[PDB]
Design a protein around this ligand. Structure first.
Ligand code: CLA
Ligand code: CLA
Ligand code: CLA
Ligand code: CLA
Ligand code: PHO
Ligand code: PL9
Ligand code: SQD
Ligand code: LHG
Ligand code: LHG
Ligand code: LHG
Ligand code: BCR
Ligand code: FE2
Lengths: 169, 306, 50, 28, 38, 34, 86, 27, 28, 27
């Protein structure tokens, strides 16, 4: 199982469509489109219910199950997804990998939690106040690389040090 | 995410709509709707306009005794010129119509709409993942429309010089333009004619070759073209051929639009008059001189007032 | 006349340049400037349009 | 009365355009 | 947005219906135009 | 026609403001696959 | 016909050149182009053969019809005047 | 008699076209 | 010109009758 | 102008109806 391994590391109908060679729209493409759409819909439906299971279980303090569930929900992330508003990632993707980043902290895994929150930042988790303020992640906050990555992704707007140094000169 | 803003944004930006709207659609749709509504209503029924501004109204509305080929929305009256003339600056609705405001309204809304349409052509292309510059290919007709409707009136200082929104009005505009400036004898209009003719030629030839090759092959069509004319081994791949097909007409129309805008500031085409002179000073007529005589006739009949 | 005509032409051409380069830059940033991946077409993930 | 004939032709054409847009036949 | 409407139905009418309708409209026309023109 | 002027102004301003905020909502483009 | 032919040439070139596949099979994505042009313009081609035959049909018809017109002019049969307006 | 002509033409065109559109949709 | 309108209506009705006769929809 | 009206009306009725008959038969 993907979940178990990652916690450890802690065509029949498509032949007609493969009309694409002839550069025609036709009907097989319509069938493939419908199948892909319904499969996608079920994909995010089951990802949502898995997230519900994950939060319900995290309420029970079984961080092991929460972590396996959160590394499974990321597993089924579709490849080459462009969102309706040019998101490039499904809206759950950013929140889940934040929660896993929290869960890794509960597991005493700050070193990989840093990478998890880096990947969370890459996805566009634009909310910056909690990561600095949230006490729950304070255990991993002690590591200097946490502040290093926060700075490279949240730069001070005004260089107080530089302006003070120039004033001195 | 049930907030009014959230659901409205999802609806507008969604591709589920029959016709994609997009943010550019927000300004694109209402502007074109206003333009087409006012255009239809004015064409169907509207009073005569004083195009030349000397109290000689010109009938242009379908209902006032003229045909489809002749009906047109008369441009703004010469008296106003470049001044902004909405409804509310007019003394009254009847005076607004007599002077010719609806043309100004239609042209403004239409220009905004076409620009927003050019934008959405990129936005949807970005959504689907395809390459972005289909809008660039669209910039040619937009440039020509802007030159005809906006830049040329700006150069001449009056809005009465814009192309009338009608067929016979278009012919009148073209004839008067040839009279004032030698549009025919200008290299940029020559490039435009070359672009249009080459586009027709390439479309016909490419259609023939591809439809003939589609039997149940492209190598056979390539050999056919190579053997037909002396030219051999060009456009070996579909990429270069289909880029050239788009590149020829677009550049041609860019150049003709730029030529029109250049003439907007009184930089006319070539003037080969009395170019050939025999000994001891006489004038030998050439085809340019007969063209000049035709221009003389057009121009002298154009000046309606003394 | 020379100034106005020359600078209008140059401005129009540079506007076309803005269109081209902005489109290319946005596409490259998104990551599909080279072309469609021929495996995961974003259009295929959408239902047929009727 | 020619005006009514012209308008009928125009609106008929627009109707054809509208039907061609929104009422398309799904191919095959 | 609301869920898909459950009670969505489509209208149908066979060739007999078309012939009946066309005949009705044309008969009414031939009957009444004589008085419309007056 | 002051009333018509204000009506046109308010509709135009509504459209323009929505036009702007629609883009300000959009998140920046990025390459997941990189 | 002539202007429509130029329009078709430009649109087809731009569409084919802007829907390539990353690198037999057709280089460009027909489905993507059909979706794009059916959502923007409203109608888009679905069959390649029909499209490449339409690109041929347009200019030929236009020039043939212009030739018929010139034949009409050869005998001074000219659509010169509208009697009612005159 | 223009009102009569237009009324008659409308009565022929709109309803028969209406029916034809439905029948085309059915088949 | 009313006569032409009358003949058009009559001929159209006759056409409807003809089509109803010879182009019947087979049952079910 | 009766001739123009009748010619136009015939050209709108006969061909379009002709197309509609065939399409109805096809479906
Ligand atoms: C988004 C759609 C849209 C847009 C862009 C326009 C734009 C315009 N309309 Mg149209 N109109 C629209 C929708 C729109 N209208 C609709 C839906 C209706 C039906 C009610 C009308 C009915 C209508 C009439 C009846 C008339 C116009 C007129 C005008 C022009 C002058 C209005 C003005 O002074 O605004 C000024 C607006 C502002 C100063 C606000 C600016 C907002 C921001 C700050 C601007 C930022 C960018 C800018 C470059 C700086 C202008 C070109 C008038 C005209 O003369 O047209 C030529 C005119 O007579 N419109
Ligand atoms: C056979 C001889 C010949 C030929 C081939 C041409 C060819 C041309 N001439 Mg020249 N010309 C000639 C003789 C000739 N001319 C003569 C004899 C005269 C003097 C009488 C002129 C005077 C003349 C002038 C004064 C102008 C031309 C222009 C042009 C160009 C027209 C196309 C264009 O630019 O529009 C490009 C495309 C458009 C303008 C269309 C824009 C469409 C918008 C963006 C969208 C519209 C949407 C629509 C309303 C809604 C659709 C509805 C939906 C249901 C479909 C083309 C290169 C024009 C030119 O160079 O362009 C500026 C121009 O201004 N000619
Ligand atoms: C067999 C006769 C013939 C020939 C050889 C040409 C050849 C030419 N014409 Mg002429 N022309 C012809 C008939 C002909 N034309 C006719 C019948 C008309 C209509 C009366 C025109 C109207 C016309 C105009 C209005 C213009 C030309 C132009 C041109 C040049 C560009 C061709 C082009 O568009 O490339 C397309 C394909 C290339 C491979 C070229 C020298 C243009 C030019 O710049 O000439 C110098 C130009 O402005 N022609
Ligand atoms: C300072 C402005 C500027 C800069 C730095 C660049 C830089 C670049 N452009 Mg951009 N571009 C600009 C303006 C600029 N461009 C403008 C204004 C346009 C509108 C036409 C374009 C259109 C454009 C396209 C369409 C493409 C580029 C590309 C490129 C890249 C390769 C350069 C190239 O094509 O090889 C050098 C090429 C040449 C020297 C060929 C020259 C051919 C022209 C036609 C010569 C014309 C000369 C003539 C005498 C000028 C008459 C002007 C008259 C009309 C007034 C490079 C990053 C290409 C790319 O791959 O980008 C990554 C690409 O595909 N650009
Ligand atoms: C005069 C010739 C000519 C016309 C009429 C024309 C027309 C069109 N070309 C379009 C596209 C293009 N044309 C292109 C290249 C070219 N086009 C050319 C020549 C033409 N192209 C040439 C020569 C080229 C080669 C460079 C490209 C590359 C594209 C496109 O991508 C684009 C498209 O979509 O292609 C499919 C469409 C844009 C639709 C639009 O505005 O949004 C829709 C607007 C609507 C529905 C309503 C507007 C109605 C307005 C309000 C009417 C108001 C009155 C006006 C002022 C007009 C007055 C009319 C009088 C003159 C009679 C439209 C059908
Ligand atoms: C009151 C009111 C309403 C006022 C109106 C007043 C008025 C002036 C009305 C207008 C009058 C009027 C109608 C005049 C025009 C009459 C006229 C001269 C008609 C000519 C008719 C005629 C029979 C001439 C014969 C010549 C002829 C064959 C011309 C055809 C022109 C034509 C249809 C050209 C094509 C135009 C066009 C927009 C094509 C785009 C096609 C398109 C969507 C391709 C996109 C696309 C590209 C790809 O590459 C791929 C791969 C795919 C997939 C794909 O999709
Ligand atoms: C007064 C001073 C004057 C100064 C003048 C300075 C400019 C000199 C001219 C410079 C010309 C440069 C052209 C480059 C074009 C290019 O790279 O396109 C790239 C493609 C692909 O090339 C294909 O590319 C293929 C792949 S690759 O290129 O090898 O990577 C390859 O098979 C091959 O190269 C090729 O076929 O080129 C083409 O397909 C042909 C395009 C032809 C464009 C026609 C324009 C028409 C203009 C006139 C229109 C109005 C009339
Ligand atoms: C002065 C005239 C203006 C300068 C020329 C600009 C020509 C732009 C034509 C746009 C056509 C519509 C887009 C159609 C389209 O999709 O084009 C696509 C075509 C192919 O680009 P690729 O996607 O292969 O490029 C990949 C990257 O390297 C970015 O190009 O772009 C070019 O190669 C342009 C190269 C310069 C061409 C210079 C031509 C000079 C001719 C002078 C005579
Ligand atoms: C302004 C907006 C537009 C407004 C106008 C809208 C108009 C809407 C359409 C109205 C007409 C609909 C017609 C339906 C026509 C139709 O298809 O009906 C079919 C219907 C029977 O159909 P069924 O219910 O069996 O069909 C079940 C399904 O298969 C659906 O058909 O018959 C009737 O109910 C009466 C029909 C009219 C009466 C028929 C007999 C009498 C008239 C013939 C007289 C001949 C001359 C004899 C004397 C000389
Ligand atoms: C937001 C933008 C809104 C744009 C609104 C404008 C929409 C215009 C839609 C034109 C549809 C033309 C009918 C297509 C009928 C139809 O069903 O075509 C369908 C056809 C696609 O055919 P297929 O590929 O399915 O054919 C497969 C073959 O095997 C044959 O079965 O579309 C095209 O190929 C492009 C046609 C462009 C032709 C453009 C002509 C424009 C004429 C405009 C006349 C205006 C008159 C105004 C009078 C006042
Ligand atoms: C909301 C919105 C939308 C849409 C919208 C629309 C679609 C609108 C439309 C609108 C329209 C569609 C409008 C129109 C207007 C029109 C007008 C405004 C007109 C005017 C006219 C006039 C004023 C005239 C006058 C006259 C004549 C010419 C005749 C007789 C004489 C007189 C003078 C009376 C959407 C969903 C996209 C999105 C969101 C936003
Ligand atoms: Fe092609």
């Amino acid at each position: 199982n993907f979940g178990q391994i990652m916690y450890a590391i802690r065509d029949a109908a498509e032949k007609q469509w493969k009309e694409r060679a002839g550069g025609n729209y036709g009907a097989g493409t319509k069938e493939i489109q419908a199948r892909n759409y319904v499969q996608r819909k079920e994909n995010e439906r089951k990802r949502r219910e898995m997230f519900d299971d994950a939060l319900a279980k995290f309420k029970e303090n079984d961080i092991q199950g929460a972590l396996v569930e959160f590394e499974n929900i990321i597993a089924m992330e579709p490849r080459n997804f462009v969102g309706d508003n040019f998101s490039r990632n499904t809206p759950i993707y950013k929140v889940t990998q934040y929660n896993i980043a929290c869960c890794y902290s509960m597991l005493d895994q700050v070193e990989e939690a840093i990478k998890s929150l880096d990947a969370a930042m890459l996805s566009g988790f634009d909310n910056y106040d909690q990561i600095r303020r949230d006490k729950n992640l304070s255990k991993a906050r002690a590591n200097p690389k946490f502040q290093a990555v926060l700075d490279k992704y949240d730069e001070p707007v005004v260089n107080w040090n530089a302006v003070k140094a120039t004033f001195g000169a | 995410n049930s907030s009014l803003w959230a659901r409205f944004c999802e609806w507008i930006t969604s591709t589920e709509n029959r016709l994609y709207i997009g943010w550019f659609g927000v300004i694109m749709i209402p502007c074109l709707l206003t333009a087409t509504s006012v255009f239809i209503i004015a064409f169907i029924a509207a009073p005569p306009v004083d195009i030349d501004g000397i109290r000689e109204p010109v009938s242009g509305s379908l209902l006032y005794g003229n045909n489809i080929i002749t009906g047109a929305v008369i441009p703004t009256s010469n008296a106003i010129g470049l001044h902004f003339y909405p409804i509310w600056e007019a003394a009254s609705l009847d005076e607004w119509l007599y002077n010719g405001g609806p043309y100004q309204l239609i042209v403004c809304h239409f220009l905004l709409g076409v620009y927003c349409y050019m934008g959405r052509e990129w936005e949807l292309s970005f959504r689907l993942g395809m390459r972005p510059w289909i809008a660039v290919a669209y910039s040619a007709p937009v440039a020509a429309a802007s030159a005809v409707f906006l830049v040329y009136p700006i150069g001449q200082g009056s809005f009465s010089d814009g192309m009338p929104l009608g067929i016979s009005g278009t012919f009148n505009f073209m004839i008067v333009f040839q009279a004032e400036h030698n549009i025919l004898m200008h290299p940029f209009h020559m490039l435009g004619v070359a672009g249009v003719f080459g586009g027709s030629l390439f479309s016909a030839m490419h259609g023939s070759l591809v439809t003939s090759s589609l039997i149940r092959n492209i190598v056979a069509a390539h050999g056919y073209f190579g053997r037909l004319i002396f030219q051999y081994a060009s456009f070996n791949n579909s990429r270069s051929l289909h880029f050239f097909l788009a590149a020829w007409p677009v550049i041609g129309i860019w150049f003709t639009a730029l030529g029109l805008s250049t003439m907007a500031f009184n930089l006319n085409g070539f003037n080969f008059n009395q170019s050939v002179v025999d000994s001891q000073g006489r004038v030998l007529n050439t085809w340019a001189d007969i063209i000049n005589r035709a221009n003389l006739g057009m121009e002298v009949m154009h000046e309606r007032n003394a | 006349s020379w100034l106005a005509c020359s600078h209008f032409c140059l401005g129009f051409f540079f506007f076309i340049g803005h269109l081209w380069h902005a489109g290319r830059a946005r596409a490259a940033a998104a990551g599909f400037e080279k072309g469609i991946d021929r495996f995961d077409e974003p259009v295929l993930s959408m239902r047929p349009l009727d | 009365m020619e005006a009514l004939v012209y308008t009928f032709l125009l609106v008929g054409t627009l109707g054809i355009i509208f039907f061609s847009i929104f009422f398309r036949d799904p191919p095959r | 947005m609301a869920r898909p409407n459950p009670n969505k139905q489509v209208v149908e009418l066979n060739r007999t219906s078309l012939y009946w309708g066309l005949l009705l409209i044309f008969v009414l026309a031939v009957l009444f135009s004589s008085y419309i023109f007056n | 026609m002051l009333t018509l002027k204000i009506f046109v102004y308010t509709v135009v301003t509504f459209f323009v403001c929505l036009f702007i905020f629609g883009f300000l909502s959009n998140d920046p483009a990025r390459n997941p696959g990189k | 016909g002539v202007l429509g032919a130029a329009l078709l040439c430009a649109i087809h070139g731009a569409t084919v050149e802007n829907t390539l596949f990353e690198d037999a099979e057709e280089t460009y994505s027909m489905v993507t182009a059909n979706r794009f042009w059916s959502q923007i313009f409203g109608v888009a081609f679905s069959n390649k053969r029909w499209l490449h035959f339409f690109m041929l049909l347009v200019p030929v018809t236009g020039l043939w019809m212009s030739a018929i017109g010139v034949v009409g002019l050869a005998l001074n049969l000219r659509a010169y005047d509208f009697v009612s307006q005159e | 008699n223009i009102y009569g002509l237009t009324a008659t033409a409308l009565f022929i065109i709109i309803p028969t076209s209406f029916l034809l559109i439905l029948y085309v949709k059915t088949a």
